[PDB]
Structures are given as C-alpha cells and as structure tokens.
Amino acid sequence: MPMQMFMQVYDEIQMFLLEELELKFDMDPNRVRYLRKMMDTTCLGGKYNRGLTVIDVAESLLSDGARRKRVLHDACVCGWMIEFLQAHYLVEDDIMDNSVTRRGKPCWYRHPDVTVQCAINDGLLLKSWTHMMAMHFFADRPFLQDLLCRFNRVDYTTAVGQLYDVTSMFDSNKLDPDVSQPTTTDFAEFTLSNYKRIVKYKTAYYTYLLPLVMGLIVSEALPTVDMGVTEELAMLMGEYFQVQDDVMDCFTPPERLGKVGTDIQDAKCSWLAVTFLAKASSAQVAEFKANYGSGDSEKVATVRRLYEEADLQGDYVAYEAAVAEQVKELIEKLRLCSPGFAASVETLWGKTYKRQK
Amino acid sequence: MQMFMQVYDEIQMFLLEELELKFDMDPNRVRYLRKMMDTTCLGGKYNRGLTVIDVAESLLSDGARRKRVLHDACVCGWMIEFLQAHYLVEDDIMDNSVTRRGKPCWYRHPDVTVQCAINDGLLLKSWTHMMAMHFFADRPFLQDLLCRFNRVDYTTAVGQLYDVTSMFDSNKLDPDVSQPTTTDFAEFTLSNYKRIVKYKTAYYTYLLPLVMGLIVSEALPTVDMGVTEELAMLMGEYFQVQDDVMDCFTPPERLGKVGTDIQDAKCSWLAVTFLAKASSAQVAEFKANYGSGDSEKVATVRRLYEEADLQGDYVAYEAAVAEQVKELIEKLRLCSPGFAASVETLWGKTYKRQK
Ligand SMILES: O=P(O)(O)C(O)(Cc1cccnc1)P(=O)(O)O
Ligand SMILES: O=P(O)(O)C(O)(Cc1cccnc1)P(=O)(O)O
Ligand SMILES: [Mg+2]
Ligand SMILES: [Mg+2]
Ligand SMILES: [Mg+2]
Ligand SMILES: [Mg+2]
Ligand SMILES: [Mg+2]
Ligand SMILES: [Mg+2]
C-alpha cells in the first residue's frame, strides 16, 4: 500500500508537470516526450527508501480519516521531492564521476541520444521540478516556509559535500583556481577525518536527515523530538550508508549493484582507500600509489587485488558491528520521549543495515 | 553601484562565515569559494541587479522604510546576479566556451576541474536560496518572491533545453537512439528562434528584475502585468539578438568572450536570418561549413554572414523593436507612470548597447 500510493502520486506529479510545459512553455510533443522519458529514467528504478521513509515517519507520528489522507498525500509529495533532488544529484554526479551505468542501464549522459551538454541541463530541470511540485501541492500549507527552508539547506549541504568529494585527491594546500595540479602523490589527505566530513555532507543529510525532518514537518510533529539525538542518528547511519556504497563500488558485481564502479579510476577518497592506507604495509602502499587513479584495466585490477589482500571486507564487518551498537543506543535514547518516531527510525535502520543493494 | 557593492560584501560575509562555522570547511576551501564567488558574480555590468533597485526605489515615489526597501532590492538584485552566475558557469561548459569577461571561463581556469565547475555552478544557485532566507525570513512577501524567482529559474532551464536541442531534428529526438547535427537546417526558423530566446533569456534578464522590484516595493498589483510581460519578452528577445550578433561581429577585447555559436551549430539570429534570405550557393556553403571548430570553416561562415549583410538586417530589426517598445511603454505610463520610467531606463541600458 505505501508503495502503491507513492506511485499514484508520481503519476499526479508527472501529469501536472508535463501538461504545464505544453500549455505554458510552448513545448512541442517531441520535447514533452523527451522530458517524460528523462523523468522516468532518472527518478524511477531505485528502492525509494528516502521517499518511503517520509511516508513511514509522517504516518507514525499523526497519532477523522480526512487528516490521515491529507498527511499521507503530503508525505508522498515530500518523498518525491527528495527522490527528484536525488535524481538531480545522480545525473550531475555521473557526469562528474565519469560513470558508465546506473541501475543496470546507461547513465543519463551516456544514453545514445543524450548529449553531455543536454544532460547537465536535464539535471537542472530535475531540481527545478522539486520547487514546482512543492508550490503546486503546498502553496496553502502553513508549513511551506519551514519545509523549503530545510529542504534548501540540505540541498546546499549536499553540494558542499560534493565539493569535498571532488577536491579530495588534491592537496588542499595547493588549491588555487588560477594555478593547476595533478592527483595527490603522497595521499596524505586520505585520512579518516577527511573521509567522515565528505560523507556527512554529500550523503548523510539528504539520505537520512531530510526524509526524517520532512516526515516530522507534514505530520506537524517536529518540535516533539530531540533534534540533537535525531541528527546524531542521521549522521551515523548516513556515514555507514556511504561506507557500504564505497565497499560495493569495488566488491559488488554490476549485475547486482546496477552500476560499474569508478572510485579507483577517479582516485576518490573512499572508505576502502582511507582504511587500506591506514593499515597496509609499505610495499602495498607503494603499489597502491603507483596504480590508483588510472582507467587502465590492470592498474584497477592491481588496486582491487591490494584491497582484497588487506582484508578490507574484514574491517568492514567490524566497522559495521560498532555502528550497529551506537545506533541501538541512540534509538533507545529517542524512544524515551518519542517511541513512535523511534520505531520509524528503527525501520529506516533495518533498510540500511546489511543491505546488499 | 555603491550600496549594491556593499550588500555584496554583506552577502559574502554571511555565506563564507557560515561555511567555517557550520560546514566544517577548512580555510583553503573557504578561500577557493570566495574566489569562485568573486570570479563568477563580479565583473559584469549588474544591469539586472541594478534594475531591481531602480524599480523598487521608483515605486515608493518614510526614510526608514526607504532604507529597508532599498536593502531588500539589493539582496534581490544579487539573487538574480547569482542565478545568472550559476547559469553562465553551466552554459560555458555546455557551449564549450573559452573566455568570459576577458578572463577564462570558470571551468577553463587552470586549477578548476570540469567536474568541480559543474558543482560550483550548483553552489551558486544554492546561495540564492541561502541569501533569501537570511535576509527575508520575516518578510510577508517571501513566498510570492521565491515562487516567482523559482518559476523564472525553471523557465530559464527550459529555455536552455530549447537552445541545446535546436540543431537536432526534433522528430529524431529519442534518448535511446542518437543523431548528428542537422543537415537541412529546417528547424532553423524564426518561429523556433523566438521560443528559444523568450525562455532562455527574456524571463530572467527582463521580467524577473521588474517583478522582484515590484514585490519588495509592495507595488505588484498596481501595474498591468500583461503589458509588462509583453515589454519584457520584446526587450529580452532583442537583447539575445544583440548577443548573437556580437558573438560573430564584436571583437573579443570589447566583448570579453570568444564566440562559439558557429562551432556549436547554434540556432542563432544570424543563422536563422541568413538561411531565410541567402542564395542557393550561399546556403549550400553554409551547410558544408557550419558547426565545426575548423578555423577555415568558421571563417567561411563569418564571411557568408558579412556577404549577406546581416548587420544591415539587424539595424532594421532594431528599428522595428524600438517602435514597439515605445508603444508599450506609453501604454504602461497611462496607469503606472513611475514604473514606465523605470522600464524606459532598462530599455536605455539595452538599446544600441555595445557591451
Ligand atoms: O551512486 P554513486 O555514484 O556510487 C554515489 O553514491 C552518488 C552520490 C552522489 C551525490 C551525493 N552522494 C552520493 P558517489 O558518492 O558518487 O559514490
Ligand atoms: O553569454 P553567452 O554564452 O553568449 C549566452 O548569452 C549565455 C546565456 C546563458 C543562459 C541563458 N541565456 C544566455 P548564450 O545564450 O549561451 O549565447
Ligand atoms: Mg558517483
Ligand atoms: Mg560522486
Ligand atoms: Mg559510489
Ligand atoms: Mg553560452
Ligand atoms: Mg548557451
Ligand atoms: Mg551568446
């Protein structure tokens, strides 16, 4: 049922958006068709965990069936706002990361009939749609300003995180727009401290915090929860989520992952890289440095081999157990004053812990 | 300019100070973003920003309230300037441009990667929302302001889609297929050109500064919005026509940017007007040489535009526009004399501009 209602609201959203373009933007049928395909390709096909979380949180906290109908419809719209914001980030990210596939299909910019220049702008259209749907459904809601204030702040935080992500292989000391420099050679910025910052801002806020907050807002329950503990939870689960993403990038097969990994080739400051460099022997580190950040098949294979030799999967399972311990504690802390909200956080945790995605 | 530039400092201080305090940002990246902001937002003529101030001030015609409206207008002005900065960073990447305002394009700076530049463009747009909330959280006009600002942002992105898909047979548009640059150039019609330019340029360059000025001076309902939109679309079309002409005919030292329309096979005013008027042999030579980075092919296309006396047609198009602008400003002046005076000034910043 939650999935059923979520998909029905997608239809309403898509119909509103596409029918407007025809009538208000002088758009021809061919370009309306193009944008319908863009929307469908970029926003559908994932698990909708962010979207579905908003619904779960909203319904969990409202406790007269008219108000339930309304809150649930508002939660569906908020959920699609987050899914569209994500779709926006993934279109741009794939171009930025030179990725090949996503969800088992070509990246948007890699479709045979999409130009990179169009794809950049298509990503922008996706973000605009979040604002368009918000105004269409919420123009008369008293929570609109607070909703969008928070939504926009998380959008901002994500872009700040993406900056951390894309500048992480560069000695930050040598960062100057008017100069230029190659990939790091000592990898001295590949610290856990730096990793934690990247991951908090690029992923945790929009993936974990935002769904929770929007759910709280449409159920008009925000002030009822300890926001400090909630944020702690969100950051911890979001860090772990990105750690899983990084591990899967190297170790999960494309048929199950849906995407071809690029972290090695792009010289990303991944969890694998930072953890490997902190533990690996001198010879291992030297071979890593000589092979990392190259598209060369065998250099990538060398790095994959080194990660395998360093038993990084091992370290992950241990990181995983420590995270799970802290999650339980914080959920129990939240349950003290907000048992309903804590139950929804537990479900979000259940969708995350040991995910095979 | 003086108060506009001091509001910039205030905006920049708020934004950069936050990043340190709230985003755990290191001094190096704060420095990087300060330079990014300065390079992308400063150096133009601030005509949209300055228009917001002119409109707001002219529609209050209390000293404390004047101070307030003017400060609000400056913030709105910078919102539009930052939104523009955002569009120009992405557009330069999309259009494979080399230079802007006599400097390298942002993505062409030696220490900027293209992947960083894309994201920098996004940061610029985010800043428009951040400044709005910092300054206007308590203003009753906030929802209406942002509603319209966001709609114009949207319209611009729709316009950019028109721009970027204009050399492709629209019948043959399918994400799952692929197709080269047009061979017959049958879509290079004046009808299609007018749609591109209305949406990519006219709304954010002409309509938005007017609307934002009306809003902060609390004067929006006082004006005929139909006639106002008419003016905005007409002046915006003409503005983009000037842009297209300058792309080919204005020297880089004066223009501040290297032209790319020919190489990118754009549906420019030059292209559409040329193809409508040129001889069979000229048309054929155009089709054989357009949309190529080849130095000799670009020179051929430039030569053909010169031979076709497009400069001539421009002067005639310009006179026709000026006639209709005068008509509409006089219509506006009937009920909104003060607003009409501000529109006339905006028109004066546009007509026969050498930029
Ligand atoms: O799905 P991807 O590309 O593996 C990723 O998670 C996508 C993404 C984009 C933006 C913010 N957070 C994650 P990345 O971080 O690039 O590894
Ligand atoms: O400044 P430019 O690049 O000549 C231009 O005017 C920039 C621009 C960007 C976005 C919307 N409108 C104009 P373009 O349209 O690409 O010719
Ligand atoms: Mg990626
Ligand atoms: Mg990425
Ligand atoms: Mg990844
Ligand atoms: Mg351009
Ligand atoms: Mg352009
Ligand atoms: Mg141009």
Side-chain angles (χ1 to χ4, degrees), chain A residues 1-112 114-255 257-357, chain B residues 1-110 112-253 255-355:
Chain A
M1 294 289 294
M3 186 65 191
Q4 154 269 348
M5 64 175 104
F6 193 55
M7 289 309 311
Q8 260 84 298
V9 175
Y10 180 80
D11 291 334
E12 298 186 42
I13 288 165
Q14 182 169 79
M15 177 184 51
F16 161 73
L17 291 171
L18 294 182
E19 287 183 342
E20 183 174 50
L21 282 162
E22 178 175 33
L23 305 188
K24 294 201 167 207
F25 295 85
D26 200 19
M27 199 172 285
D28 58 276
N30 291 322
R31 290 184 178 73
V32 174
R33 176 185 180 200
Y34 177 91
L35 292 177
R36 175 189 301 272
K37 292 163 158 198
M38 195 271 280
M39 199 191 299
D40 281 353
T41 300
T42 59
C43 304
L44 305 173
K47 258 34 264 186
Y48 316 109
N49 282 337
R50 289 155 192 90
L52 290 186
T53 296
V54 179
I55 299 171
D56 190 52
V57 173
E59 205 188 351
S60 286
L61 300 177
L62 37 67
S63 317
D64 176 34
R67 182 174 176 257
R68 176 196 174 267
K69 280 194 71 197
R70 185 230 310 157
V71 170
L72 275 294
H73 193 273
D74 291 357
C76 288
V77 174
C78 286
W80 280 113
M81 286 174 75
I82 305 172
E83 296 292 332
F84 273 56
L85 178 69
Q86 192 188 23
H88 156 82
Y89 275 109
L90 309 174
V91 165
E92 306 300 355
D93 179 83
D94 281 333
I95 297 162
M96 289 163 63
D97 297 347
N98 200 26
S99 287
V100 180
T101 64
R102 178 171 299 277
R103 300 161 190 169
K105 326 200 271 190
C107 295
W108 186 241
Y109 85 110
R110 289 284 181 117
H111 278 237
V114 179
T115 62
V116 201
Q117 64 270 23
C118 203
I120 297 170
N121 194 73
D122 293 340
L124 298 189
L125 285 168
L126 285 159
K127 182 178 270 174
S128 270
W129 285 337
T130 70
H131 291 108
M132 297 307 98
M133 71 178 79
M135 194 59 57
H136 177 251
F137 293 107
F138 306 145
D140 298 312
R141 300 282 194 272
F143 63 61
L144 179 64
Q145 176 167 333
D146 185 40
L147 221 225
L148 279 164
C149 180
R150 296 167 188 275
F151 183 83
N152 290 154
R153 284 199 68 82
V154 167
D155 178 24
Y156 185 38
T157 69
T158 310
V160 170
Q162 286 292 84
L163 164 76
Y164 293 151
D165 171 280
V166 84
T167 60
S168 64
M169 342 65 196
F170 294 90
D171 179 352
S172 65
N173 220 351
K174 304 181 175 188
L175 198 61
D176 178 336
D178 296 315
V179 184
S180 188
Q181 224 62 72
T183 292
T184 182
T185 38
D186 65 19
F187 297 70
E189 298 271 50
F190 276 41
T191 66
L192 187 54
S193 193
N194 281 339
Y195 177 76
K196 284 169 139 297
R197 183 174 70 163
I198 296 168
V199 130
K200 168 175 187 162
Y201 293 100
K202 80 169 184 168
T203 293
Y205 277 97
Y206 91 91
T207 305
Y208 286 88
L209 189 272
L210 186 54
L212 298 175
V213 159
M214 296 190 91
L216 293 162
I217 282 171
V218 303
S219 266
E220 307 171 280
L222 195 38
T224 72
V225 312
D226 187 326
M227 189 54 66
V229 169
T230 303
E231 287 194 16
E232 268 193 74
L233 272 158
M235 301 303 103
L236 178 66
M237 293 188 284
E239 174 183 284
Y240 169 75
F241 184 87
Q242 189 56 49
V243 166
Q244 292 173 308
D245 191 66
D246 290 354
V247 171
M248 295 181 300
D249 204 71
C250 182
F251 293 109
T252 304
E255 332 81 67
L257 191 55
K259 69 202 179 186
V260 174
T262 55
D263 291 350
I264 290 151
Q265 297 89 327
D266 295 350
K268 291 289 170 38
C269 181
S270 58
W271 186 81
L272 289 174
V274 308
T275 303
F276 169 91
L277 290 167
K279 83 179 283 180
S281 69
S282 296
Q284 280 165 325
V285 169
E287 199 176 10
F288 172 90
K289 288 179 170 184
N291 286 278
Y292 201 63
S294 164
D296 186 290
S297 186
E298 193 47 54
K299 291 197 186 171
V300 179
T302 296
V303 175
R304 199 176 311 269
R305 197 223 316 146
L306 284 164
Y307 287 166
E308 281 151 21
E309 285 172 5
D311 183 41
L312 294 180
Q313 266 108 129
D315 306 348
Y316 169 72
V317 180
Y319 166 79
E320 174 174 68
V323 170
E325 160 183 278
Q326 306 192 186
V327 168
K328 186 190 186 79
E329 285 188 284
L330 290 166
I331 288 175
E332 283 320 311
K333 296 200 212 306
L334 207 56
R335 207 191 301 277
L336 270 22
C337 305
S338 305
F341 185 56
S344 75
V345 177
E346 210 154 359
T347 298
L348 173 55
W349 178 233
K351 301 185 183 188
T352 305
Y353 178 75
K354 291 195 182 187
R355 74 189 173 103
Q356 296 290 313
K357 287 272 92 62
Chain B
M1 198 68 90
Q2 169 170 48
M3 95 183 89
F4 194 56
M5 287 315 306
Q6 86 178 68
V7 175
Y8 181 81
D9 291 330
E10 201 174 343
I11 288 161
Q12 184 170 79
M13 181 191 288
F14 163 72
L15 292 170
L16 295 184
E17 144 247 279
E18 195 185 32
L19 282 161
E20 146 208 285
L21 286 172
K22 290 198 162 197
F23 294 83
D24 304 308
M25 199 173 279
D26 56 281
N28 310 249
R29 288 182 179 75
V30 178
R31 200 182 54 241
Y32 175 91
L33 291 178
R34 174 186 306 272
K35 267 104 246 112
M36 198 260 85
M37 199 191 300
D38 281 355
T39 300
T40 56
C41 301
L42 303 177
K45 269 153 175 65
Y46 315 116
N47 284 150
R48 21 227 130 166
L50 296 179
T51 298
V52 178
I53 297 167
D54 189 52
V55 174
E57 196 196 345
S58 67
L59 298 169
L60 46 81
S61 196
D62 183 11
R65 188 204 166 210
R66 179 203 172 256
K67 266 193 70 180
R68 177 197 315 143
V69 169
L70 267 290
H71 191 276
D72 291 353
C74 289
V75 171
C76 285
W78 282 113
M79 285 173 78
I80 304 171
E81 295 292 330
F82 275 56
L83 177 70
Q84 188 186 28
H86 157 82
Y87 275 110
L88 308 174
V89 164
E90 307 298 357
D91 179 81
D92 279 336
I93 298 165
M94 291 161 61
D95 297 348
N96 195 41
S97 289
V98 182
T99 291
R100 183 173 294 281
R101 296 171 211 154
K103 303 178 181 191
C105 296
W106 185 242
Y107 86 107
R108 289 283 182 116
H109 279 235
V112 177
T113 65
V114 195
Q115 65 273 18
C116 203
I118 295 167
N119 193 71
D120 292 343
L122 299 187
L123 285 165
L124 283 159
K125 177 175 269 169
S126 264
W127 286 335
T128 68
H129 292 108
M130 300 304 92
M131 69 178 81
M133 197 58 63
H134 179 251
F135 292 106
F136 305 145
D138 296 327
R139 233 66 111 211
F141 65 58
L142 180 67
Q143 178 167 327
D144 187 37
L145 222 221
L146 281 170
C147 182
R148 294 163 189 275
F149 181 87
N150 290 158
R151 286 197 67 82
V152 167
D153 178 22
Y154 184 38
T155 71
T156 308
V158 174
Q160 286 293 85
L161 163 78
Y162 292 151
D163 171 279
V164 110
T165 60
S166 64
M167 347 65 192
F168 301 110
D169 195 318
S170 67
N171 252 190
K172 301 185 173 183
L173 204 59
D174 181 335
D176 298 314
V177 180
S178 189
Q179 219 55 70
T181 300
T182 183
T183 41
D184 61 22
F185 294 73
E187 303 282 80
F188 276 39
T189 65
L190 186 58
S191 210
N192 280 338
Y193 177 80
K194 283 165 136 304
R195 180 176 70 162
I196 298 173
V197 166
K198 168 171 190 167
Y199 293 102
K200 84 173 182 166
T201 292
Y203 279 96
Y204 90 91
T205 304
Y206 286 89
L207 220 214
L208 186 61
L210 297 177
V211 163
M212 294 193 94
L214 291 164
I215 283 169
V216 304
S217 63
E218 306 163 345
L220 190 33
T222 69
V223 309
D224 187 331
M225 189 63 263
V227 169
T228 305
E229 288 199 11
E230 265 195 77
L231 274 157
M233 298 304 102
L234 179 63
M235 292 191 281
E237 176 185 284
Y238 170 74
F239 185 87
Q240 189 58 50
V241 168
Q242 294 171 310
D243 190 65
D244 290 356
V245 173
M246 299 183 318
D247 206 69
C248 183
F249 291 105
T250 300
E253 333 82 65
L255 190 55
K257 66 198 179 184
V258 182
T260 55
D261 289 354
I262 289 147
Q263 296 91 327
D264 297 351
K266 288 290 159 74
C267 181
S268 63
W269 186 82
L270 291 176
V272 307
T273 305
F274 170 90
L275 291 169
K277 84 180 287 189
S279 74
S280 294
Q282 282 163 320
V283 170
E285 202 176 2
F286 173 92
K287 291 180 171 173
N289 285 277
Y290 203 63
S292 166
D294 179 348
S295 165
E296 62 197 291
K297 296 205 203 320
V298 177
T300 293
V301 178
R302 197 178 299 270
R303 194 218 313 147
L304 284 164
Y305 286 165
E306 289 156 11
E307 287 175 4
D309 181 42
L310 296 182
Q311 226 93 80
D313 293 38
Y314 170 74
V315 174
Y317 165 76
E318 176 180 68
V321 171
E323 167 185 278
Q324 311 194 184
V325 167
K326 194 185 170 78
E327 287 166 14
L328 285 165
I329 288 174
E330 281 322 309
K331 294 197 218 303
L332 208 57
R333 209 194 301 280
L334 269 17
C335 303
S336 305
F339 184 56
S342 74
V343 177
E344 200 160 335
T345 301
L346 174 56
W347 176 234
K349 295 181 186 172
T350 307
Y351 181 75
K352 290 189 179 178
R353 78 188 170 104
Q354 295 295 314
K355 285 296 102 80

